[PDB]
Design a protein around this ligand. Structure first.
Ligand SMILES: Cc1cc2nc3c(=O)[nH]c(=O)nc-3n(C[C@H](O)[C@H](O)[C@H](O)COP(=O)(O)OP(=O)(O)OC[C@H]3O[C@@H](n4cnc5c(N)ncnc54)[C@H](O)[C@@H]3O)c2cc1C
Length: 285
């Protein structure tokens, strides 16, 4: 859809989530994570750089984390338009960067393309090694790029020293890292993404909890059905998902035939049956 419509839609979704009045530590926690992310964007980021004209590019790889961020970002883009009108919708696409690699799952590539069309992203896609170099090439093509939005957060307990607004290290080309999802935990991610009713990468439906490349990521061994029985913690969000109101259906994207072959050897609960952040990357490495 056109960008103004995507932005207004995401605004309604986020607003609707913020109006959930349920007994729930998860919901209340996620409402707080939403408010902080939106405060970073509206109060610290969009005040300093334009989210429309190319000063900022959004790094998007179709994963759950940058998808949640993209929905929040679009919600803030809607609000930004009115704030700037108040202090003084364009027909265009949102500048976005996707690094495509040889080991990228086709299912994910397809999801990136489809959601680029849904959210009206103007996609730069690299030609299918090291991410630092991929971005160095990007910045050389688009030197006006001042900042890049990154859906990074803490997914193991180890010290990382990340900040919401942070310069790249000297290894990397110079631009500002914008990392407003940093305080989200795994339960917040699933609660919001399932509530949104937006389509999500079909790999999560097959037991992935973290998506890498074909060779470095698998369904989460802790979701293997014959040896684990996790409870569903997001039933309310699923049943009452935005605009849904078949209540129990989850909007997963199609698995590419090649990936279906690759996964035939796999007996796994969907990713949203994992809430233990310590175990999020267990299917990786
Ligand atoms: C734009 C950018 C700038 C970075 N700058 C530094 C730096 O200065 N110093 C440093 O030590 N490390 C830097 N990194 C690496 C980063 O800190 C993480 O160590 C690395 O991304 C792996 O973390 P992760 O596995 O948790 O998340 P990842 O799986 O890498 O995902 C984290 C986020 O990065 C973006 N991303 C990941 N893969 C892609 C892709 N293929 N295409 C487009 N976006 C993608 C998405 O927004 C995603 O939400 C940078 C990474 C990116 C993407």
């Amino acid at each position: 859809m056109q960008l103004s419509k995507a932005a207004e839609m995401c605004y309604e979704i986020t607003n609707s989530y913020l109006h959930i009045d349920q007994k729930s530590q998860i919901i209340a926690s996620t409402q707080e994570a939403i408010r902080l992310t939106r405060k970073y964007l509206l109060s610290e980021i969009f005040v300093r750089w334009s989210p429309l004209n190319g000063e900022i590019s959004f790094s998007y790889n179709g994963g759950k984390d940058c998808q949640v961020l993209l929905l929040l970002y679009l919600s803030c883009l809607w609000e930004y338009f009115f704030i700037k009108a108040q202090n003084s919708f364009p027909m265009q696409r949102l500048p976005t960067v996707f690094i495509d690699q040889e080991e990228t799952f086709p299912t994910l590539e397809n999801f990136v393309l489809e959601t680029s069309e849904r959210y009206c992203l103007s996609l730069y896609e690299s030609q299918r090694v090291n991410m630092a170099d991929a971005f160095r090439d990007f910045i050389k093509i688009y030197p006006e790029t001042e900042a890049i939005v990154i859906g990074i957060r803490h997914t193991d307990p180890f010290g990382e020293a990340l900040k919401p607004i942070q310069r790249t290290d000297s290894n990397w080309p110079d631009f500002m890292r914008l990392q407003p999802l940093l305080h989200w935990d795994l339960t917040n991610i699933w609660s919001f993404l399932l509530y949104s009713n937006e389509p999500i990468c079909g790999l999560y439906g097959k037991g992935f909890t973290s998506i890498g490349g074909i060779n470095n990521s698998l369904p989460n061994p802790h979701l293997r059905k014959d040896s684990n029985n996790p409870a569903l913690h997001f039933e309310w969000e699923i049943i009452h998902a935005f605009g849904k109101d078949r209540s129990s259906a989850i909007n997963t994207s199609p698995i590419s035939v090649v990936d279906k072959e690759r996964f035939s050897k796999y007996n796994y609960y969907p990713g949203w049956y994992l809430v233990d952040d310590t175990l999020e990357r267990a299917g990786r490495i």
